[PDB]
Amino acid sequence: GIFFPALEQNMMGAVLINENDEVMFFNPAAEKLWGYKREEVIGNNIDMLIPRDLRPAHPEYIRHNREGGKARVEGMSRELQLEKKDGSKIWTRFALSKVSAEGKVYYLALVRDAS
Amino acid sequence: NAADGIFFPALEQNMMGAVLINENDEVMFFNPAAEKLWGYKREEVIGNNIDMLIPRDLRPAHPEYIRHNREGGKARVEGMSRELQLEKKDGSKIWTRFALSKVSAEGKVYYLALVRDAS
Numbered sequence: 001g002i003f004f005p006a007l008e009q010n011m012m013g014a015v016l017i018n019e020n021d022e023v024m025f026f027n028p029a030a031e032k033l034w035g036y037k038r039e040e041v042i043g044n045n046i047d048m049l050i051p052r053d054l055r056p057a058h059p060e061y062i063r064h065n066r067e068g069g070k071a072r073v074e075g076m077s078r079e080l081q082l083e084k085k086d087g088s089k090i091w092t093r094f095a096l097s098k099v100s101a102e103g104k105v106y107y108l109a110l111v112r113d114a115s
Numbered sequence: 116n117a118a119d120g121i122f123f124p125a126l127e128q129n130m131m132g133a134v135l136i137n138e139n140d141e142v143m144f145f146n147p148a149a150e151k152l153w154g155y156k157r158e159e160v161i162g163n164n165i166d167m168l169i170p171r172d173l174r175p176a177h178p179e180y181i182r183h184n185r186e187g188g189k190a191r192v193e194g195m196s197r198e199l200q201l202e203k204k205d206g207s208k209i210w211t212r213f214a215l216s217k218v219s220a221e222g223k224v225y226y227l228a229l230v231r232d233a234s
């Protein structure tokens with residue numbers, strides 16, 4: 001269809017995760033933001049895409065959002081610091097969305113450069 | 116068909132509005148997030164031209180913006196992200212944040228504008 005090509009060729013990065021926080025999607029816009037190729041990210045946990053200073057705390061924020069039930073995600077509204085592979089940091093804007101797909105809970109983070 | 120997958124429900128249940136148009140400038144997609152931004156139902160937008168979602172003061176210039184990008188090619192390069200004044204159905208105006216993209220599929224050209232509230 002036109003839905004896979006739309007997110008794949010989106011100017012905004014697109015990081016979909018499944019029920020176990022495993023990255024199932026990582027388009028070329030997200031490859032330039034994070035400095036990771038899609039081969040390095042797919043299958044592994046979300047941990048790598050989270051900054052190292054926020055690594056310990058972030059898994060509890062995802063788990064709490066799943067048990068809540070709420071459709072609309074109110075978190076990650078203002079500018080946040082994305083960390084790349086090489087360690088350098090750029091400012092960004094996340095548009096996080098809960099996605100009821102395949103009888104499970106997902107999360108799509110649409111990211112852009114807000115430098 | 117597409118609702119059984121993961122990519123349709125990603126854009127359909129996205130917090131950002133999602134307006135897709137095909138090669139003939141006809142809106143083939145209009146999720147519930149875009150229904151609240153524009154004040155239009157999905158039935159009022161699907162099948163109709165793109166100029167209905169453009170503000171009336173920007174209607175003279177917008178058909179020539181789309182036409183130029185189609186003739187350009189440029190080995191494909193999405194476009195841009197900026198803040199644009201959206202005009203609703205009732206006539207009121209809110210400021211937003213578009214994120215226009217260019218998506219080649221089946222040898223045709225489409226455009227997905229991801230919108231959110233910037234007020």
Ligand code: HEM
Nearest residue numbers: 015049050061062065073074075076080081082107108109
């Ligand atoms: C640049 C990398 C990221 C950073 C720095 C980051 C940072 C944060 C922070 C600080 C919070 C807690 C604060 C708040 O409510 O805003 C949060 C919440 C959350 N994040 Fe992340 N995040 C990143 C990437 C992601 C990705 C890729 C996903 C999944 C696609 C994700 C999913 C979530 C979820 C589900 C919450 C819970 C929000 C809520 O309870 O409403 N994050 N993030």
Ligand code: HEM
Nearest residue numbers: 134136168169170180181184194199200201202226227228
């Ligand atoms: C709130 C309604 C909209 C407004 C006010 C608006 C405004 C504009 C403006 C001002 C430009 C010129 C580019 C610039 O000066 O930055 C433009 C270009 C363009 N617009 Fe719209 N737009 C709207 C909705 C849409 C939608 C929904 C689509 C299709 C999904 C679309 C497709 C395009 C395309 C393909 C271009 C050419 C980009 C370029 O090469 O400059 N517009 N629009």
